[model samples]
Target: MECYRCGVSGCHLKITCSAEETFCYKWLNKISNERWLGCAKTCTEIDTWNVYNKCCTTNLCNT
Candidate 1:
C-alpha cells in the first residue's frame, strides 16, 4: 500500500485484514492512533470514506 500523501512512510493507515476489499473500510472513520501524537483539529478535511471493490485475483479467499 503506497500512499501518495505519506511519501514512502506509506499511508498513515496500515491495516491487517483477513479479507482484501480493494479499498478497505479500515481506512475510514477509524484511523490508527498516531503513537501518542495528537490529531490535527483544523485539517479542513471532513468524512473521508473508502469504497471497496470485489476485485480479487486469487480464488483462495473465495473458498
Candidate 2:
C-alpha cells in the first residue's frame, strides 16, 4: 500500500483507507502521486475497525 505523499509501499506498511477509494501502490519504480489501476497485491494490513490484521489473500476485497 502507498500514500504517494510519503513514499510508503509494500507489505511492510498499508493504507488506512479501503483498497478502492483511497489506496494505490508506490510501484516497482515508485511513482509518487500517480495511480495504478491493477498492481495492488497481498499485504498485511491492519483494519481500522477492530485493529485486527486484514490481508488481501485471506479476506474479501472489491478491488
Candidate 3:
C-alpha cells in the first residue's frame, strides 16, 4: 500500500507502506497548529480539545 508521509511541516511525499502497516493516518495538534501523516497498523480515531486524528485504509488515504 502507499501513503503520504509528513511531519509538522506538512505532507509533501508519498511512501510505500510495509506489510505490517495496513492503514494511513493524519494527526493534528490544534493547539500547536501542527500536523502529521503516516502509515500505521491500526486505525484509531482520536478527538480531544487540542488534538484530532483520522485513519483510513486506502492509498494516500491520509490526505
Candidate 4:
C-alpha cells in the first residue's frame, strides 16, 4: 500500500509501504506541537491529554 510519510520537518511526501506494512498512521504530539504521518503494520488508536494517534487501511487515509 501507499501512504503519506512525514515527520518533524513537514508533510510533503508519500511512501510505498513494504510487504509487512499494511496500515497508514497519523500522530499528533501536543507537547511538541508536532505531527507525523507514516506507514504501520497494525492499526492502533491512541488518545490522551498530550497526544493523539490513528491508523487506517485505505490509501492516503492517514491524511
Candidate 5:
C-alpha cells in the first residue's frame, strides 16, 4: 500500500509494511525540532522513546 515517507536520512527511516500491519506514523524531535515520518514493518520502528508521534491510516496521511 501507499504510505508517507519523511524523515532524517540514515536515521529515522521510511518503510513499507505487509498485510500484518496497518499503521503509518510521523515523529517530532523535541531537541532538533526535526520531523520524522514513515511507513514501518512494526510500530516500535517509530514508537520510540523521547519522540512525539502522530499516526494515520490513509495513504500519505502522516502529519
Candidate 6:
C-alpha cells in the first residue's frame, strides 16, 4: 500500500505492504497545524491546513 497528498505532484512517498491489501491515506489540516499518520510519509503540505482535508483508499494508497 501507498499514500500521498491528494493532487500533490512530484512529492512522492514509497512504502512496502501487501500487494493484495488496500490502505487509506488521510490528512488533517487545521490551519497553522497539519498532521499525517499511518505508514508515515511526510512531504510539503498544508497551505490551508484544517480548512481542507481528505481520506483516500485507492490502488496502492496512506500516510
lDDT of model 2 at position 43: 55
Question: Against the true structure, whose lDDT is highest?
Answer: 3
Going through the candidates in the order shown, the clash numbers are: 0, 0, 0, 0, 0, 8
Q: Write the per-residue lDDT of candidate 5 for residues 6-29, one digit (tens) a residue.
A: 544544344565676577777777
Ranking by TM-score: 4, 3, 5, 6, 2, 1
Model 2 agreement with the true structure over 1-63: per-residue lDDT tens digits = 333222335333333544653433332222333323222444544444434332333211322
CA lDDT of each prediction against the hidden true structure? 0.26, 0.34, 0.82, 0.81, 0.63, 0.45
lDDT per residue (tens digit) for residues 1-63 in model 1: 211122235445333233333222211234543221112212222334432212223222111
Candidate 1 residue-pair clash tally: 0
| TM, every model | 0.16, 0.19, 0.80, 0.80, 0.49, 0.36
Ranking by lDDT: 3, 4, 5, 6, 2, 1
The lDDT of model 3 is 0.82
Better of 1 and 4 by lDDT: 4
**lDDT at 63 for candidate 6?**
39
- Candidate 1 lDDT score relative to the true structure: 0.26
lDDT accuracy of residue 41 in candidate 6: 32
Candidate 6 similarity to native, TM-score: 0.36
**Candidate 4 per-residue lDDT over residues 9-60, each given as its tens digit:** 7676778989988898888888987876788887667778888888898998
lDDT of model 3 at residue 43? 79
Looking at model 3, report the run of 10 residues with the lowest lDDT sum. Answer: 5-14
**Model 1 vs truth, CA RMSD:** 12.9
Off by over 4 Å in 3: 7-10
Q: Distance (Å) between predicted and true CA of 38, model 3?
A: 0.6
Worst 10 residues of 4 by lDDT: 5-14
Off by over 4 Å in 4: none
